[PDB]
Ligand binder design. Structure first.
Ligand SMILES: [Br-]
Length: 208
C-alpha cells in the first residue's frame, strides 16, 4: 500500500520543534539502559543548556516522568505496556507495535519483542535488529496502522490503535469492526518494518 501519508504525518507529529530529533536519539539510547533519565544527563550529552532540553520536552505532551521528575517514557518506556521490548538483560516497554520496529535502528541494538494478538490474545514475538527482523512467531504476524493527527497527543490518536495480530486475515476481521478511524489499514509485519525504515531515514536526515 501507499505509505507516504503515514510517514509524513508521523514526522509532523514527532518533530514539533527544532532539536527534537537531536534530542530523541540520545534519549532513546539512555532509556535503553533501563534507568530513569535526568535532564542534566541529556544536557551534557547534547551540549545544551538544561532549559532547552526542558523546552523540547514541554512540547512532548505524552512524556512520562517518575516521582523524582526524571524521564521514564518517550516512545520507549520503563512503565509496563502491552509491548515488551528487551535489550540484553534489560526489560523495557514500548508505546505501540510500530515503535518496536523503529527503535532498534535508532538505538543501534537488537531487541527481543513480545506481545499478544489484540484480537485473540495469542502470544506473538520477534527479534528486531537495526537492519532486519527474524524469528517472527507466528510467521504471518500483522500490524494495524492509522493516520496520526498533527495537533493531538500521539498516544491517544495513534499508539492506542497500532497493535500486533496473529495474522493478516485475523487482523482484517478485527478491522471490519473498527470504522471511523482515519486511514485504518492492516499490513504484514514485514511491510510495517519497511515503513519504519523509511520513517527513520527521513528522521535521521533532519539531525545536526
Ligand atoms: Br500517497
Amino acid at each position: 500500500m501507499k505509505l507516504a501519508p503515514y510517514i509524513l504525518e508521523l514526522l509532523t507529529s514527532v518533530n514539533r520543534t527544532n532539536g527534537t530529533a537531536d534530542l530523541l536519539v540520545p534519549l532513546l539510547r539512555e532509556l535503553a539502559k533501563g534507568r530513569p533519565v535526568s535532564r542534566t544527563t541529556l544536557a551534557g550529552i547534547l551540549d545544551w543548556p538544561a532549559e532547552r532540553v526542558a523546552a523540547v520536552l514541554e512540547q512532548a505532551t505524552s512524556t512520562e516522568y517518575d516521582k523524582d521528575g526524571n524521564i521514564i517514557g518517550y516512545g520507549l518506556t520503563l512503565r509496563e505496556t502491552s509491548y515488551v521490548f528487551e535489550i540484553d538483560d534489560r526489560r523495557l516497554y514500548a508505546w505501540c507495535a510500530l515503535d518496536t520496529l523503529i527503535f532498534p535502528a535508532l538505538i543501534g541494538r537488537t531487541a527481543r519483542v513480545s506481545s499478544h494478538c489484540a484480537a485473540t490474545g495469542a502470544p506473538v514475538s520477534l527479534t528486531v535488529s537495526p537492519s532486519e527482523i527474524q524469528a517472527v512467531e507466528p510467521a504471518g504476524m500483522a500490524v494495524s496502522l492509522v493516520l496520526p493527527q498533527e495537533a493531538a497527543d500521539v498516544r491517544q490518536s495513534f499508539c492506542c490503535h497500532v497493535h500486533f495480530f496473529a495474522s493478516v486475515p485475523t487482523a482484517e476481521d478485527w478491522a471490519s469492526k473498527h470504522q471511523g478511524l482515519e486511514g485504518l489499514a492492516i499490513v504484514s509485519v514485514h511491510e510495517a518494518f519497511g515503513l519504519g525504515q523509511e520513517f527513520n531515514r527521513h528522521l535521521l536526515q533532519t539531525m545536526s
